[PDB]
Structures are given as structure tokens and as C-alpha cells.
A paper describes a structure:
On the wobbly side, the N-terminal ACS domain resembles that of the crystal structure of the open state. The triangle state is an artefact due to the binding of the 6xHis tag to cluster A (Supplementary Discussion). The triangle state was not considered for the ACS conformations as it is not physiologically relevant and is probably an artefact of the interaction of the ACS-6xHis tag with the Nip. The triangle state was not found in the reduced state, which could be due to the reduced affinity of Ni ions to histidine after reduction.
CO-dehydrogenase (CODH)–acetyl-coenzyme A synthase (ACS) is an enzyme complex in the reductive acetyl-coenzyme A (acetyl-CoA) pathway that reduces two molecules of CO2 to acetyl-CoA. Finally, the two branches merge through the action of ACS, which catalyses the condensation of CO, the CH3 moiety and CoA to yield acetyl-CoA. ACS binds substrates at cluster A. Cluster A is a [4Fe4S] cluster connected by a cysteine to two Ni atoms that are bridged by two further cysteines. The Ni ion proximal (proximal Ni, Nip) to the [4Fe4S] cluster is the site of catalysis, while the distal Ni ion most probably plays a structural role as its oxidation state is unchanged during catalysis.
Author numbering:
A (entry chain A): 318 to 736
B (entry chain C): 316 to 736
C (entry chain B): 317 to 736
Write the structure that this text describes.
């Protein structure tokens, strides 16, 4: 814990609070007003170090139930600070004030949302304590790169309408930077091991065309973390000793994994799953499995609670996919790795995928359609994907695959067996 | 199969303690709301009972023609040097244990309301009830060579005496029940355990606390304490509440050490107040099972006695096969039906406010406790009206619209597990 | 395992999976349409010539498309360590040391030897002497210690093919009679191949004269022949001592043997019971049996049959539960011949307690299931009592049908119980 004498009710409610309409002190954004929650870098000649101010009415000073602004602007300057340290530093707001209740905040880029609740308004002390806590934590956790920190908490419409421009596109474009950067354009793939607490053997090598299975750490973020902290869990790895571009195995990756994953796993194949895939830790967003009977791939996310054609639901699959065991045929991948060019390149990529939940089809509809159109599979390739309503068993799915002429059936199968 | 050595012409076998009853084919009925019977193990003074006074106060099986209803009140009064008044239910459970899973009369509900349908073949064979109590004398003396001193059986038959015996049983029920709700987790610094279930689940260890009952639904914390007092080297040993590791999630060093010892080191960390992270294992005898649905953001409390589809897409039997045996599966928990009424019912996961689906029978049986707990939690007495049932829908797509229409409070809470994104 | 003689086609491990249709089929040799067979016969050095490909008939380079060439592969071996019992094993190795080359699509064995060669060899100039010399060189490389003189004759004369297939079929009948004669009571030592350990080191298929191995092809005779050829090989005799549970088939000596070559991961072993200490499967298994407490009986499903099952999960789920070297009680992987074995879980009710089987399996075992029912007194009508997918498929479908047809398992002692 943090052990501060704050009034706010210490809890994990910041993550995904869906506030009731009849209680919320502030529900910003929502197609009605601006919204933001931002950490940015400013010049040394226009900011004051240690200043903590709460612009607009305080928590107690206004009655509950209104629709007013909310937002934390943390302006930090240092000698070595760069413009690319925002996405990694700002995430730490989810670990300073996140032991509290009555908030909703994320994604400080160009347009999206921010909120707050009531019951954290009359516990005795004001938001100035929150600002001071944030200033202290930013001065403490990152002493190398920042030398002056200022915090403001705006709650007035006009001063935050300028900030309406700060919650949708910057970080979206920062991951689109991974999208546009090719796998081989860069010359140093980065590592990730922060998930060692649940699975130490997980040494996840992130690439500019393959986000980590956590869904949060990318190559740009790993590089920024290394620049912030050379000793940090993300470490730099050059590319040496090419073995096979088809599966994507180098020498430095293999040696690093062998000497860091406790010698359980030696070789790694970035572009395929059926031979030397990458380990997981239990933080995967989706699960990818092989269906020789359907001759394709099955992808199921965490938020599905139904029956699967393979016969096992997601909860059962996580029992064996995770842990840190190099299992061929099963893997855990993020929901943004599906729309990547190097997504199981050897094993058919997007073509081999057959079945996935309907909700995940809708969420990834546009990107999957774009990726299918890029590869020539046709714009209507998403309709060729069998959903849960179409059939929950292999014997049900196969007639639909025959009807729709799925390309997975047409091409050759994989992983034959012995007698 | 357990055997005996009593000399009676009746057919000892599948027809004396463990099968259903119907009124039409019943020869003589012993119990129910019409001709109530019971079975009590109380404590009385030495002068109140002659040692080994196995009697039959009233007609025997042959002396009664088909048409008359009588009870068999097995009033096993026990006097001892060290016996207490709290030790009654521990032995009282064992009286029907000699013939429960074999012999085939009835024991409805539990405790002291066994219902006996004495067969016509037993009446024709013309035995007596003296040996019925003689069997419960020798076996009782064999099982308890350290507490009991005198054992009696006093089978009454008079209808007014039937009502008097029923009133005595109801008086004893209140004494045995009111103590449990008085206890609390914080009051006592010692927690007992239970490893009786290792016969078909060696890797499973179940921790019992004043508020959390055992998953078997049978033993409580008081029962475990009484068994430890009676059996100092039995399958239950005390553990001091020491070495606190996680206060909110309920983890202690001593509990972790005990589990790491007994559970063959497969389980080392256990949480006493949450399901999604380090849930407690289960033998396979759980009264009910609760699963977490990320789509609905809540708990589905489906019990063993209810057969049917569940929102997760499978019946109780499949979930039991997935969970029981000691497999520590996050997102699923095996609990006793009374544990739902505990004040510390998954406090780390928001408690009763995170329950969205219950079967109709289980919901109706626990209406009285769910309303009382909703009033205490501040959710209001109408909380049971917000809980979906199988009539509302057997699938997520059928109950989610009903849940959002009812404004279930769990929709206003954050999801579970350890966050990463 | 490559070669040296130049061929009109390549030589790689990936050509064994080639797909050739009827239009691309130049001339088949054997299978379900035409007669062709392999053979390995015991000979002496009196009238054998090394590498003599005595092709009696037209060569494969001068045959019209769509024709038929009956192929009799006679193998003449001069071996000091060789015996007449090693003939089948070498035949199996014909599959191993022939498919490594392109165009050598070879399937089945015995009188069902099916080899297909497309026009990629006939049009590009491949002779039958190429095949003969390739087989000779493959036998020399695979078995350099035992063989000394090799003659891979390839008869292609229809009259000679038939009069030689008569000898081959008589030899096959003798092999089958030798398999039938031996029984687990008289035979003291079993064997175990570890070719299946290439994926699951802990797993060890156990092969006995009555209960065949999980692979369904390596019988007791073949394992004994391989041990005689290769004493260092995976198979090792196991003395029959330390009988702990004769009801379910527990021997302490076999338990020690399991300790020896399975990293001591398995303590005991019930050869006649799958519930207590079963044996896992590496995928070589040909069928899966499971226990159903609802009907209290065994269910057996072969690999080729998928779909919904009374146990509640598909065959893929069962394979995942039992395969991968993982030992799970209550389920087992078995070979097809084991169903007809008289040691079929005798303590666990034998054939009586297994009622749910696919109809195709009933048709395959028409001379086996009925014969076993007659042996046990069940009568040939027991197949009517056998639940098949043509009548009932789910638990509820067979719930009243078992009672109507007189289910024997419920009429006998059940297994497994609850707690309270
Ligand atoms: S996704 Fe999680 S486990 Fe994988 S590298 Fe990133 S932090 Fe580590
Ligand atoms: S309820 Fe059952 S499993 Fe739990 S401690 Fe008691 S006997 Fe053991
Ligand atoms: S059945 Fe499988 S594991 Fe056993 S000897 Fe044969 S190939 Fe090896
Ligand atoms: Ni993880
Ligand atoms: Ni139990
Ligand atoms: Ni149990
Ligand atoms: Ni095998
Ligand atoms: Ni196998």
C-alpha cells in the first residue's frame, strides 16, 4: 500500500467504475462536454515546482449530482525529459491515486472520457491532498529524468475545453506507429518480464509488429521504459544470428530467454505457434488454438462465458495455455496482435482463423476487414468467419465452412502424426 | 459393507435408514408432522439413568397391526465425567451413521427428525426393538471409550408423549442453533480445520471459521471444536490466527503452513474472503457452487439439488466435475448453503451485491437470510427481487437484459482478478 | 536416410505426404482394388545375388497409364543373427525405409501393400531396378550388423504373384495363429516399445500377448523379435513376480520396471483395470474408454469417430485428457485388438459393462464382439443390448433403452460413491 493520511476511501474503484447516474458528482465527456486526464512535459520558464492547485469548485463546495469537469494535468520538466516519456509516466497515475474510490480515467490523447463519483467528496479533506500526493510520488519514483513537477485539477468547462483535445488520438497514433513500423525496419527487439510474479518463465519478446500479450506494453513503451530505467524489467536485445526468417528465430533472443526464463525454454519462433511458440503468464487477452478437424485457428477472449467448438471454454484453456510452458498449438495473444502483418505469418495469418466470439468479431470488425482486403481475401472475409451462433461444435461449424468456401479448408493442413 | 452380529429374524440390509418413504405403502410411520419421531443424545445425571437400560416403552413391531402410527424416540441419554452440553450433535450425527448409506428408511432434513417406514416383512418376522437399542449401546460404547459411561434407549409410543418428545426436540434445536449466529470471525483467534474429506480428495484441505461453515455443509466451527475436544488426535486440529499476510483477502502464515503440509504442497497460498484469486479447494461434497460471469459481472449460485442449465452453459454436474477433487480453479467456488448468510461472505469481491443468478428453489429456501443480509448491507429488502432465476433465462443473453432492466448494483462495480490493463 | 543412386525425382522427408489423384495416378500396386503384397522370407546364400533386382515382368518405365502391375516384394537376407521371427519386423521397416523418397506413397502391409507412383517417374525415366537397388541399399543401411547378403526381388508375373501371395497369406495365417496361441497366463515376460517416447518421455505403452499395445500394430511377437534383434532396444522382458492385486493385475516386478525407464513417475499399474493407476497415451492409441457413473459403465470410442458423446465431451477433449503423457484415472487409451482380448478389464466387468460403442466399431468387430459374448455366455444377442449411435446417443436417450434391453452393468456391482 501507499499509507497516506488521505480522506478518499482507499479502494481499487478507479479501474472500471460504471457510476450510477443518481450519484455521480461529475460525469464529464460523454458527447456533452470536454474530458481529459493528462501528464505532459512543459518548458522550464512557464511552470512552478511544487505548486498544487484545484481550479474550480472543490469537492465539498458543490452539491452532488452535477455535470461538471474533472481532470488531472501533471506538467513535468527535466533536463533529459523527452516527448515520448508521457505514455509510460502517465500510467503511474493508476498506481498513485488508484487506491481510492469514485473515479474513471484513462487514455489522454485527443478526445475521450473522464469521470468522478460523489462519496469521495465529503470525507474531510480536499483534492489538494491528492495533488500533493501525486507531486510527491512523481518526485520520488522517477528522480533521474524530472526535476520540476506541477499538478492541477481543473473542474471548469472553459479551461478544460482546450483539454477536450487530449483523450483519444495521441496514444492511438502511438500504437499506430507500431502498426506502420515494419517488423524488420527496427534493429533491436525489446523484452518484457514484469509478469514474472504469476509466471517467472514468461520472457515475452515484444516486437513493433507484435504487442505483448498483456495488451499494454509495446515496443515503443518498452524502449521508453528502458530509457527511463536502464535497470527496469524491459531490457534491450540486439538482433543477431539469424536462423529462419519464415518462423523468425534469432540467436540473441534464444540466449536471453535461456538465461532468463530459467533454462526451461531455449528457442523461440515469433511467426508461428506450432513449433517453439512464445510463453504466457496469465495476462493474455485472447487464446488461440488449433483445430485440425476444422483445419484452422480458434480465438476466444477473456470476456466469453459460453461453449466452444474445441470443447473447452476459455477458463479451462487458461489452465494449460498460461504458466510459462512452450505449448505448440495453443498461445495467448493480445487483441491488437490479430490485426498485425506478422500475426502467425508462417501459419496462414488471418486466413487460418475460423471461429471467434461474435462480440470479438464486432470489436475487431473494421481492422479485420482492412487486413483481409490488404491480403486480397476480400472485404467480406468477416462474414466467412463462423461465430458462436452459427455453431458451437465442430460438426456444426464444418457445414458452414463448406458453404462459405473458407480459405482455411482450401490450403494444406499442419502437424501430422505417427502410427 | 458394514455388518453386525445381532440375533434378530428381521432382514438387515438396504431397508432401515437411508431411502425415501411414501404414505400409501407405509406399514408404520415414525416421524413427520403427523406421528413425529426424533433421536436425542442429551446429558443427565447418573441417578437419572441405569447403565445399559435398553428398554422398549410400548408395543414392539409384531404387537402393532398395520394402521397404527408410533414413533421410535432413540433418547440416548449420556452421563460422563468430562461430557459437556455442546458435544451432543457430534455423537447425534453418528446414531444414523451406522446404517445411513446402507439401510433404507428415511432421515428427512437432518438431526433429530428421522422418518422410519417399518416394513411389513419386519412385522411378520416378529422381532422386538430391544436389540435395536442393544446395537446402539455396544457400538456407542465401542466408538466412545473416553466420554460416555452409561447408554440407554427409551422408545416411547404415546401420542401425547409423542408431542412432548417433539417439544423437547424443538427445545434442543434452538439451543444447538442459536450459538452459531452469535459467533464471529474476529471474536475467536483460533480456527479449526478438517481433513475428513481426504478419502476421495487427499489434496484438499477445508478451513472452518465461526462465520464460514465447511463446504460439506455438515460440520461448523463449533462441531470441529467439539470433535477436537472429543478426539484430540482426530482429523481436525486447531490453528492460531498468527502470521497475518493479507488482511483484506484473508491470508495467514499459519494457515498457509498447515495447507502446505497437508495438501502435499500443491496449495501454498489461500484466500479466505475471495474467489477469483486463490480460492479454497473442495472435496466434491459442496452443497452449492458459485461461478463468476465476466459478461454479467456477477455470481451464479447454483446448488446440487437443482438440476438444469446455468448461464455459464452447463449443469451442476459438469461444474462439480470441473471443480471438486482439490483442483484450485479461480472463478469458481464450492460453498455450503448456510455460508451465503455469513457476514464475511466474499467481502473482498463486494459480497452479496455481486450475485445475479440463483435457481428458484435455492432462492426461495434462502429468502429469509438473503433479505436479512440485504437489509444489513444497505441494499434494501427488495434485493432478492433483482436476482435473476432460471425462469428469467437459462443463457446470458436472456438474463442480461433483465439485469439491466432491474438495475442490478453489480453493474456499477469494477470487475475482478488482478488488474493489468 | 538418403540414397546415392540418381533418380528422376527428389529424395526428401516431405514427399511422404504427397496427394495424388486417380488422374495423376499412373499405375497402382495393391490396395483395395488390386492385389499386391510385401514379403520377407528366410533363405540361404546358395542362390542369392547381391542387389539382383530380378524383375519378372514389364518394368515400371514401359507400362501404359492406368494399368495394373501386381507387385510381390521378396526379400532374401543372409543373417547370422537373423531368425524366421524377424520377418514381420523387417516388413514394417519396408514402410520406414521406402517412404523417405519421392513418389513412394506406400500404405498398409501384408496382402494390402498399396504403392502409388505417378507419371513423374514413368515419364522421367524411373526403372523398377531403381526401386530394387534402393530397397537393397536401405536394408543395408538400416540393418548393417545383421544382414550380410541382400536380394530384393520384385516379382511382377500375375501367375507368380498369385502363387506367391498364397505363401504370403499362409505365413500371415501362421503369424496370427502364433499371436492367438500365446496368453498372458503362460507368458511370463511382456515388452514395451519406446518409439512413442519421441513426444512423451514419461509415457510407456505396455504390450502383452493378450492385451495388445496402444499402438495397435506392435504386438507381443514383433516386440520380442525386435528385442532379439536389438537387445539394447526399448523392449525388455519383465519377470512375472511380486503379484500384489491379481484381481486388477498388479505385479511388483512390473512396477519396478516402470520405475526403471519412466523416471519413477508411476508407482503401481493395474493391467486389468483403468480406474486405479492407469497408463497414459502418446497418441499411438486407437481407441479411448471412459467411465460413466450415470449408467455406471464403460464407453469405448475409436479415433475416427468424433462428435457428441454420453460422457459429455468430444473425442478431442478425451485425447487431451489422456494424451500427452498425462496419467488420469477413470479414462484409458486402448488398442482395437485389446477389445477382443479375454483380459479386457476382467475385474471391471469385461465386455458386460461396455454398452456404448459406435456402429462402425460393431461392424468391424462382428466376428470378435459376438465371439467374446458367446465365450462369456452373453450370447450373440448382446450386440442388440449394445447401445450404438444409430439408436441412442445421449445419456437420456440410452437411459430407458438400457433398462429395456437388460443392461448388465446396473444389474451388477457399481463403482465410485459420494461422501455425504
Ligand atoms: S505481455 Fe505481460 S507477460 Fe508478456 S512481456 Fe508484456 S508484461 Fe511480460
Ligand atoms: S466440509 Fe468436507 S471437505 Fe470441508 S473440511 Fe469438512 S469434511 Fe473436509
Ligand atoms: S503402444 Fe505406443 S507407446 Fe506403447 S510400445 Fe507401441 S508405440 Fe510405444
Ligand atoms: Ni499472465
Ligand atoms: Ni468432504
Ligand atoms: Ni466432496
Ligand atoms: Ni506412440
Ligand atoms: Ni500414443
Amino acid at each position: 500500500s501507499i499509507d497516506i493520511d488521505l480522506p478518499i476511501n482507499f479502494g481499487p474503484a478507479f479501474e472500471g467504475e460504471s457510476i450510477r447516474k443518481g450519484d455521480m458528482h461529475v460525469e464529464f465527456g460523454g458527447g456533452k462536454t470536454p474530458s481529459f486526464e493528462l501528464v505532459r512535459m512543459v518548458g522550464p520558464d512557464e511552470i512552478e515546482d511544487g505548486k498544487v492547485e484545484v481550479i474550480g469548485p472543490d469537492i465539498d463546495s458543490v452539491e452532488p449530482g452535477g455535470r461538471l469537469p474533472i481532470g488531472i494535468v501533471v506538467d513535468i520538466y527535466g533536463r533529459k525529459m523527452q516527448e515520448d516519456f508521457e505514455p509510460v509516466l502517465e500510467r503511474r497515475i493508476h498506481y498513485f491515486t488508484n487506491y481510492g474510490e469514485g473515479f474513471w480515467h484513462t487514455a489522454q490523447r485527443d478526445l475521450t472520457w473522464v469521470r468522478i463519483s460523489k462519496e469521495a467528496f465529503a470525507k474531510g479533506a480536499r483534492l489538494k491532498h491528492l495533488g500533493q500526493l501525486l507531486y510527491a510520488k512523481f518526485k520520488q519514483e522517477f528522480p533521474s529524468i524530472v526535476d520540476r513537477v506541477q499538478v492541477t485539477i481543473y473542474t471548469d468547462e472553459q479551461k478544460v475545453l482546450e483539454l477536450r483535445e487530449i483523450a483519444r488520438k495521441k496514444y492511438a497514433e502511438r500504437d499506430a506507429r507500431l502498426r506502420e513500423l515494419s517488423d524488420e525496419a527496427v534493429d533491436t527487439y525489446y523484452s518484457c518480464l514484469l509478469c514474472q510474479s504469476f509466471a517467472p518463465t514468461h520472457v515475452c519478446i515484444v516486437s513493433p509488429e507484435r504487442v505483448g500479450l498483456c495488451g499494454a506494453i509495446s515496443w515503443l513503451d518498452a524502449k521508453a521504459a528502458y530509457e527511463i530505467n536502464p535497470n527496469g524489467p524491459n531490457q534491450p536485445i540486439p538482433k543477431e544470428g539469424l536462423i529462419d526468417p519464415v518462423k523468425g528465430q534469432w540467436e540473441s533472443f534464444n540466449e536471453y530467454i535461456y538465461k532468463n526464463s530459467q533454462r526451461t525454454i531455449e528457442r523461440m519462433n515469433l511467426y508461428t505457434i506450432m513449433e517453439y511458440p512464445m510463453t504466457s503468464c496469465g495476462c493474455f487477452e485472447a487464446i488461440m488454438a488449433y483445430l485440425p478437424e476444422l483445419n484452422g485457428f480458434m480465438i476466444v477472449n477473456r470476456e466469453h462465458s459460453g461453449m466452444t467448438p474445441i470443447g473447452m471454454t476459455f477458463s479451462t484453456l487458461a489452465g494449460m495455455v498460461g504458466g510459462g510452458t512452450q505449448t505448440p498449438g495453443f498461445m495467448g495473444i493480445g487483441k491488437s496482435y490479430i490485426g498485425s502483418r506478422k500475426f502467425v505469418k508462417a501459419d496462414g495469418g488471418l486466413a487460418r482463423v475460423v471461429w471467434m466470439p461474435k462480440d470479438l468479431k464486432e470489436q475487431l470488425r473494421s481492422i479485420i476487414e482492412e487486413r483481409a482486403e490488404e491480403e486480397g481475401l476480400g472485404r467480406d472475409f468477416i462474414d466467412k468467419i463462423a461465430d458462436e451462433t452459427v455453431g458451437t461444435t465442430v460438426d456444426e461449424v464444418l457445414p458452414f465452412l463448406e458453404e462459405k468456401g473458407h480459405p482455411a479448408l482450401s490450403m494444406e493442413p499442419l502437424l501430422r502424426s505417427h502410427h
